[PDB]
Amino acid sequence: LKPYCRPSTSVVLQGLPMVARKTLFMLPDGGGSAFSYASLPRLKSDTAVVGLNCPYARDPENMNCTHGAMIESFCNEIRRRQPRGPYHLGGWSSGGAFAYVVAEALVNQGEEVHSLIIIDAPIPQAMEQLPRAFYEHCNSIGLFATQPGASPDGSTEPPSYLIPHFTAVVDVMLDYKLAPLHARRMPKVGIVWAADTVMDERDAPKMKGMHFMIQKRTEFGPDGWDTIMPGASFDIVRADGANHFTLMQKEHVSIISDLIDRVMA
Separation between Cα atoms, residue 17 and residue 26, nearest integer Å:
13
Separation between Cα atoms, residue 238 and residue 206, nearest integer Å:
27
Edge to edge, the sheet with strand 87-92 lists 9-14, 47-53, 22-27, 87-92, 113-119, 188-196, 234-243
Q: At the top level of CATH, which class does the domain 1-265 belong to?
A: alpha beta
| Residue numbers annotated as active site | 93
Separation between Cα atoms, residue 101 and residue 149, nearest integer Å:
27
> Alpha-carbon dihedral of residues 26, 27, 31, 37, nearest 10 degrees?
0
Task: Write the CA distances from 141 to 137, 149, 212, integer angstroms.
Answer: 7, 16, 20
- Taking the CB of residue 56, how many other CB atoms lie within 10 A of it? 22
**Per the omega criterion (within 30 degrees of 0), is the bond before 164 cis?**
no
Experimental method: X-ray
- Four-residue CA torsion sign, 242, 118, 15, 144: negative
Separation between Cα atoms, residue 91 and residue 74, nearest integer Å:
13
